[PDB]
């Protein structure tokens, strides 16, 4: 099914969540 998986690359709900979580974090580190 998956090209990403076969190449051993990050993708999916948890990885998208990780990125978004960090985005909010770094924003709030000064705010």
């Amino acid at each position: 099914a998956c090209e990403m998986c076969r190449l051993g690359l990050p993708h999916g709900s948890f990885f998208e969540l990780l990125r978004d979580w960090k985005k909010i974090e770094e924003f709030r580190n000064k705010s």
């Binding site: 998956c2 990403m4 998986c5 051993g8 990050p10 993708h11 999916g12 709900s13 948890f14 990885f15 998208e16 969540l17 990780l18 990125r19 978004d20 979580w21 985005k23 909010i24 974090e25 924003f27 709030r28 705010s31």
Partner: protein, 222 residues
């Protein structure tokens, strides 16, 4: 193969014991390192790539994204397109998951969650629109792309957004600054917070999720 799976599941279990609180999740300084380490692990876990996002994760993100444990300068939230689109997607998952599980006072709790969801969703979109209009120059590329994905299609709002899109800075700021007072963020924080807790309650009462609503339940028997 599944040594990675047994690991990831335990990390997911651990997050669950940090993310499921009675009231909303906020990332406290004493939790943040382990909460970060867990998310990162699951983010790069090969075996998690096609696993369903559990509803506690989506809830905890929404709580954290919209700073729901407060009651709001409007400006603790990052109003970036890439993030808020995904935030709406995750919010959409919670509502679908709620609807699906509900089929298997219940009328009131279902109907309120419906009304609250749409109200919150609309508010998120309206405040996303507000941020898009404050750009100089305006990111029409993502702005119109957003309006296809999220936000309904009425000639009225479609053209009114377009009309206002071609006005300038001080007038664009004025329409927003008037409408932010006419539609305050405190209204939606309330709504979104009540939705999340309304949702939490249904799923523990009926579907037997455990969202620490045990104390809330017994106070409704009395």
């Amino acid at each position: 193969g599944s040594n990675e799976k047994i690991r990831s599941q335990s990390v997911l279990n651990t997050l669950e014991t940090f993310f499921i609180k009675e009231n909303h999740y906020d990332m406290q300084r004493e939790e943040s390192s382990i909460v970060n380490a867990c998310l990162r692990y699951l983010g790069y876990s090969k075996s998690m790539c096609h696993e369903k996002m559990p509803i506690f994760m989506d809830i905890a993100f929404i709580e954290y994204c919209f700073n729901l444990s407060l009651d709001p300068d409007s400006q603790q939230i990052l109003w970036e397109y890439s993030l808020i689109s995904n935030a709406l997607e995750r919010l959409e998952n919670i509502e679908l998951e709620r609807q699906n599980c509900m089929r298997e006072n219940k009328e009131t709790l279902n109907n309120e969650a419906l009304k609250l969801y749409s109200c919150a969703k609309a508010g998120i979109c309206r405040w996303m629109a507000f941020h898009f209009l404050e750009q100089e120059p305006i990111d029409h590329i993502n702005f119109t792309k957003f309006l296809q994905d999220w936000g309904s299609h009425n000639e009225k709002e479609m053209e009114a957004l377009q009309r206002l899109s071609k006005h300038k800075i001080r007038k664009r700021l004025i329409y927003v600054s008037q409408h932010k007072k006419k539609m305050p963020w405190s209204k939606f924080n309330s709504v979104l917070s009540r939705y999340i807790q309304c949702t939490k309650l249904q799923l523990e009462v009926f579907c037997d999720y455990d969202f620490k609503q045990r104390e809330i339940v017994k106070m409704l028997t009395s």
